[PDB]
């Protein structure tokens, strides 16, 4: 079955900016208290990052890929689970799934079909808070496929909505020679849901080497069954796109990335 | 010899760089891992016939061969690619395994551009084919003693098809023009015969279990290659070392810095490797390169005399016989005798030592 | 069949530059020694 919603609310494309974010550790590699300068895909500062809000109210359509991508979502009750990414995604080429489940999330890579509206919606149920998900209907079975993987799943909090927004999951996507490289962080913010100043370093997480040709991707988002038919909480979530720049990057004493520079910014940051 | 001439006056000369020799060679890698679970294929219930032939895909997983290989459990042997003794060292993407169980008359045209019953019908291969055959004598278990007529084989094909285009249809096959109707007639043939195992069977139609290994090369990251091997740490010693690809010469010392725990390699200002951790246990050890320096040779002219004096620079001349003593902020000079005497310079060594000839 | 001549499909390992081999004892595919001329990986180091 394929099963499609239909209350949901369509708005325009909020512009915001980051003035810090997207700054990632290049390599595996020890530097102390030293001054490096690398070219490499990096999330332009002070960009026009498109804001996205999921609040019975889903806008999720598909957004063209290159060069990897910048997501950063902060939502409490773990209604977000993964995407696709894909091509065509329409049972002909070989596509890939992610899905984070409250158990080992699961990595996929092989042929599927999808519904117009497919999603992992959880039914509500009074006997417990956390009850068990009842509607994941993106596909039965396309064909033999490719690839398969498990993981230990990468937060948690199932329910829960705090005044103080503990979950601020940022990463970033990019694929290069059949290798495709995934950078992760989760920090809490305890103020105004917008773009926070400082600065953080991205750790890197996990490398998948399958080799395909990668040009759309969407998001998959659950679903509750809590009041009106289908009716969710508040989410939203930021995207923005990569570019190919040279930054300057200090590492401390202990060997953890402190600060950063954009060397195509104004004339002070490239006589720096 | 250096300075192309048969008389030598008072003074320093520079030449013959030295540099200690090292021991022996290392390498360090992670454990073995996720091997891959051909051995049930191998040790199954039911194995395939040469019409259906169990073809499986192999990825992301490492197949231990030498242990098979080298084990006498196997009968007859044949790699197209390379030598054997190496095939833990060639990386492939993907794997296509083929096994299956025949009649081992026919074995010789397994072997791609061969003609035969075998092959030219179902069982090809292209003529720039790579993988290992590998065939072991099995009229053990597959011969049956009333025959095992469950085997099949595709004995009849219109057209040769190509190279790992297994058909599994059983048309009756028109071996002539005349039109075939009813299941069975004139001209119609069933294309699959049934194999003839029995333990009173002769050399030839003992069953062979074979199993062809072709794999895809570059055009996605390569996965599925044998295992390596490791020997345990030395320190205190210039030897060489293979950490992670990266292949060094040095001294192995213990660290007091602290790698987050996913960096691996120590780098300096200068932009060298001086800092790797160890694949098997988590530690992170500094690499100091072995000594190194010119030697100088101090003399009076060889109208004098003839005794000489030689200078190490910058090494703890405890380490000379690797290769009368003194030692100065300059390196060690061995050759002459120091005295507590003072005099105005001779000849300049270095942090205020001269050396001079004199009086015996 | 001109099966008359033979070349040396099995050896050890490379050669340096300009040497031939005439010996044609069995070979050695498996680290077990191959006793007598015949068993296990005992082949013969030529092929037609
Ligand atoms: C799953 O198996 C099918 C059947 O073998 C594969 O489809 C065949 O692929 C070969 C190789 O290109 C073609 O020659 C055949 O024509 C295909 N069959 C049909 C009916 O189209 C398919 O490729 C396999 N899927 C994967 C992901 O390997
Ligand atoms: C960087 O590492 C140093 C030590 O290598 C850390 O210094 C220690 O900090 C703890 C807690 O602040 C103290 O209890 C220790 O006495 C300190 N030891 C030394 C030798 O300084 C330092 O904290 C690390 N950096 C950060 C940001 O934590
Ligand atoms: C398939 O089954 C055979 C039968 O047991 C296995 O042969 C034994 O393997 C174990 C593994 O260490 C050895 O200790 C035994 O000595 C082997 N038997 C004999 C008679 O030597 C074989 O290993 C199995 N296949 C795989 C891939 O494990
Ligand atoms: C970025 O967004 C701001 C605010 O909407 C807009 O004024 C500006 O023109 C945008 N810059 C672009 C799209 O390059
Ligand atoms: C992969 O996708 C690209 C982008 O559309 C297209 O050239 C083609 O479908 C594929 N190319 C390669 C080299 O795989
Ligand atoms: C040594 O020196 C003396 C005087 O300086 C000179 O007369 C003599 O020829 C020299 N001998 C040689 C072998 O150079
Ligand atoms: C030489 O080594 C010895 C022992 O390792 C040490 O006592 C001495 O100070 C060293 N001298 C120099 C010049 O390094
Ligand atoms: C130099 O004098 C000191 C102090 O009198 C003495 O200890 C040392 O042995 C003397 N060395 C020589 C070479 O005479």
């Known amino acids: 079955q394929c099963v499609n919603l239909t209350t949901r609310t369509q708005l325009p494309p909020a512009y915001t900016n980051s003035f810090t974010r997207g700054v990632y550790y290049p390599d595996k590699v020890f530097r102390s208290s030293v001054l490096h300068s690398t070219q490499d895909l990096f999330l332009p500062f002070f960009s026009n990052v498109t804001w996205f809000h999921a609040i019975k109210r889903f806008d999720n359509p598909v957004l063209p890929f290159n060069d990897g991508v910048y997501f950063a979502s902060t939502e409490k009750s773990n209604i977000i689970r993964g995407w696709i990414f894909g091509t065509t995604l329409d049972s002909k080429t070989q596509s890939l799934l992610i899905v984070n489940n409250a158990t080992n999330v699961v990595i996929k890579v092989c042929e599927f079909q999808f519904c117009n509206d497919p999603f992992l919606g959880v039914y509500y149920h009074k006997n417990n808070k956390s009850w068990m998900e009842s509607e994941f209907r993106v596909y039965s079975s396309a064909n033999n496929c490719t690839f398969e993987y498990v993981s230990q799943p990468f937060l948690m909090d199932l329910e829960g909505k705090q005044g103080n927004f503990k979950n601020l999951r940022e990463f970033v996507f990019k694929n290069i020679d059949g290798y495709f490289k995934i950078y992760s962080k989760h920090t809490p913010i305890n103020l105004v849901r917008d773009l926070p100043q400082g600065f953080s370093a991205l750790e890197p997480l996990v490398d998948l080497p399958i080799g395909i040709n990668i040009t759309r991707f969407q998001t998959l988002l659950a679903l509750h069954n809590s009041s009106s038919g289908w009716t969710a909480g508040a989410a939203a979530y930021y995207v923005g796109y990569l570019q190919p720049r040279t930054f300057l990057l200090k590492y401390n004493e202990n060997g953890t990335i402190t600060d950063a520079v954009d060397c195509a910014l104004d004339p002070l940051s490239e006589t720096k | ?360």
């Open chain 2, 1 to 360: 010899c250096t300075l192309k001439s048969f008389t030598v006056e008072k003074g320093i000369y520079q030449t013959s760089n030295f540099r200690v020799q090292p021991t022996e060679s290392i390498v360090r890698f992670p454990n073995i891992t996720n091997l891959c679970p051909f051995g049930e294929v191998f040790n199954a219930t039911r194995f395939a016939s040469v019409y259906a032939w169990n073809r499986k895909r192999i990825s992301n997983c490492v197949a231990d061969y030498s242990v098979l290989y080298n084990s006498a459990s196997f009968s007859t042997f044949k790699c197209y690619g390379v030598s054997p003794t190496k095939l833990n060292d060639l990386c492939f993407t993907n794997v296509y395994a083929d096994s299956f169980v025949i009649r081992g008359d026919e074995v010789r045209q397994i072997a791609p551009g061969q003609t035969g019953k075998i092959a030219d019908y179902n069982y090809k291969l292209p003529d720039d084919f790579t993988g290992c055959v590998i065939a072991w004598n099995s009229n053990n278990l597959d011969s049956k003693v009333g025959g095992n007529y469950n085997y099949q084989y595709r004995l009849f094909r219109k057209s040769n098809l190509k190279p790992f285009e297994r058909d599994i249809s059983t048309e009756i096959y028109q071996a002539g023009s005349t039109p075939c109707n009813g299941v069975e007639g004139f001209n119609c043939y069933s294309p699959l015969q049934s194999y003839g195992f029995q333990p009173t069977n002769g050399v030839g139609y003992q069953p062979y279990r074979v199993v062809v290994l072709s794999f895809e090369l570059l055009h996605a990251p390569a996965t599925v290659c044998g295992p390596k091997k490791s020997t345990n740490l030395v320190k205190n010693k210039c030897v060489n070392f293979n950490f992670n690809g990266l292949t060094g010469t040095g001294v192995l010392t213990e660290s007091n810095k602290k790698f987050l725990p996913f960096q691996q390699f120590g780098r300096d200002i200068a932009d060298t490797t001086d800092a790797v951790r160890d694949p098997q246990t988590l530690e992170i050890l500094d690499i100091t390169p072995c000594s190194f320096g010119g030697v100088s040779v101090i003399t009076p002219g060889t109208n004098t005399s003839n005794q000489v004096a030689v200078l190490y620079q910058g090494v703890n001349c405890t380490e000379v016989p690797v290769a009368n003593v003194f030692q100065t902020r300059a390196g060690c000079l061995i050759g002459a005798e120091h005295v507590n005497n003072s005099y105005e310079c001779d000849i300049p060594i270095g942090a205020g030592i001269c050396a001079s000839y004199q009086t015996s």
